């Protein structure tokens, strides 16, 4: 269906220890391909999937480049978010930056998008129309003046409508053995009695791509969430991912509880039952 | 790709 | 990562055409600029290349065309009037987070 | 806009300069140049935000420093021996592509006996 490209930045400052750690991912879809740590001895962008390995040498000079930059902007970011918001030199504080481009099905432009955060807070993002921002607080309209004044949205939007499309299809044909599969959710179903009167029923999903998926419990055919534990869908290291979805049940009418399973991997909706 | 140097806040 | 500006010096008399040539080296995404020096003003941009149209069409009647297959930017103008008589520097910055690249430049005179 | 040392200037065989260029824009890179004739723009130094400078293909002789957003004081050493030049400082808002550079008005520097 459709796909998207996402970069991620974090900077932390190191207050009198030394310059901020800096850690960079990009991602297409639920797969990261590329990585840069500024702890790591190499001090290059590195390739995390197999189809980036097709890239000469000229893309990993241009990518290293950039992405230092990006840490050198963060860096200074740093200082003067501190000084705009009163803070000492002391305390270790955080920079994050996300940004990327959807595509639809037809692999034509979507949106885009570029969002910044101190602290773990939204501090500013640019709108769906690419040419405003939206500042959280105070401090970040200092930002949007700025911005706003020296018309970076213009550039960004040239990026994300264009420089991003149009990489984002290339990496979708490297690498269609990987990134156009859909590995289908290989289910199963588990049993456990709380107490006497009480049993677990725990509806499995393991093994699946991409990582978007639904898992739903009915009682009598109708939804229900009262006693419906869920946990948050996991990676299982190989490009996959896991999720379980559990409820109590009373011990003896396992037979009317149904667990519901939709992914993009299905052609039909898988419907689990406990005998 | 990524994106070039970012402007500073 | 070179620029080169072919022609150093190029005499013309009114009315006639300009063609200056520009090429570069390097072979990735490029954006490309033109920038003219009056005698006795600062260096300003005459033109540049965003994105869209590779015909770019500038102030003073000035056009460039952005070949990306040849990796051209050659600036042109159909009729050069005596005010023209300036130095013209060809710029082109290869999105690598490096400097942008100037030409040698070429010195236009226009015969009166 | 950019703001330099006056347009002239001159030196002695072992003294040192410091020209000073200035933008109030809210740039983050600043740029030196040294405008040869025959040879077009040379660049001496470069500096994409504060804090930060890296050298050009001339930065043989010179020094510079960017303590402050506004502020890329070239100086020149007495180990560069040209008996004139012409130096030109450029900011940009990022050193992005899709940013032009804007010079200042220029400084002649000759060596005066």
């Known amino acids: 269906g459709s796909h998207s490209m996402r970069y991620f930045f974090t900077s932390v400052s190191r207050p009198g220890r030394g310059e901020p750690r800096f850690i960079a991912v990009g991602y297409v879809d639920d797969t990261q391909f590329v990585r840069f740590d500024s702890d790591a001895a190499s001090q290059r962008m590195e390739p995390r999937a197999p189809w980036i390995e097709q890239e000469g040498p000229e893309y990993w000079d241009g990518e290293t480049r950039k992405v230092k930059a990006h840490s050198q902007t963060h860096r200074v970011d740093l200082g003067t978010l501190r000084g705009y918001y009163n803070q000492s030199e002391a305390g270790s504080h955080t920079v994050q930056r996300m940004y990327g481009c959807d595509v639809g099905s037809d692999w034509r432009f979507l949106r885009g998008y570029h969002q910044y955060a101190y602290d773990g807070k939204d501090y500013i993002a640019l709108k769906e129309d690419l040419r405003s921002w939206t500042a959280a607080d105070m401090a970040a309209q200092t930002t949007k003046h700025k911005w706003e004044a020296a018309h970076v949205a213009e550039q960004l939007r040239a990026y994300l409508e264009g420089t991003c499309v149009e990489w984002l299809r290339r990496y979708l044909e490297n690498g269609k053995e990987t990134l156009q599969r859909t590995d289908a959710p290989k289910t199963h179903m588990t049993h456990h009695a709380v107490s006497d009167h009480e049993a677990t029923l725990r509806c499995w999903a393991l093994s699946f791509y991409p990582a978007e998926i639904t898992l739903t419990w009915q009682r009598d055919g109708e939804d229900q969430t009262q006693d419906t534990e869920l946990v948050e869908t996991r990676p299982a290291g190989d490009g996959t991912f896991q999720k379980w979805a559990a409820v109590v049940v009373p011990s003896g009418q396992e037979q009317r509880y149904t667990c519901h399973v939709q992914h993009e991997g299905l052609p039909k909706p898988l419907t689990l039952r406990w005998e | 790709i990524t994106d070039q140097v970012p402007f500073s806040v | 990562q070179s620029v080169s500006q072919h022609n150093h010096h190029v005499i013309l008399s009114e009315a006639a055409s300009l063609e200056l040539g520009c090429n570069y080296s390097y072979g990735g995404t490029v954006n490309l600029f033109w920038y003219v020096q009056y005698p006795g003003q600062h260096l300003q941009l005459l033109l540049k290349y965003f994105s869209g149209d590779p015909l770019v069409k500038g102030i003073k009647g000035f056009e460039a065309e952005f070949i990306k297959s040849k990796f051209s930017f050659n600036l042109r103008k159909p009729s050069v009037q005596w005010s023209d008589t300036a130095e013209y520097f060809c710029?082109?910055?290869?999105?690598?987070?490096?400097?942008?690249?100037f030409g040698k430049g070429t010195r236009l005179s226009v015969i009166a | 806009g950019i703001t330099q040392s006056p347009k002239y200037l001159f030196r002695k065989e072992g003294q040192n300069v410091t020209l000073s260029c200035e933008q109030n824009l809210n740039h983050d890179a600043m740029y030196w140049y040294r405008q040869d004739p025959g040879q077009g723009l040379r660049l001496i130094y470069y500096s994409q935000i504060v804090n930060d400078f890296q050298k050009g293909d001339i930065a043989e002789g010179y020094s510079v420093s960017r303590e402050k957003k506004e502020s890329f004081p070239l100086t020149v050493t007495s180990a560069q021996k040209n008996p004139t030049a012409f130096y030109l400082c450029?900011?940009?808002?990022?050193?992005?592509?899709?940013?032009?550079?804007?010079f200042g008005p220029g400084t002649r520097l000759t060596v005066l006996e």
């Open positions: 710029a082109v910055n290869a999105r690598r987070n490096t400097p942008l690249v």
């Open positions: 450029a900011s940009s808002i990022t050193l992005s592509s899709y940013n032009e550079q804007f």
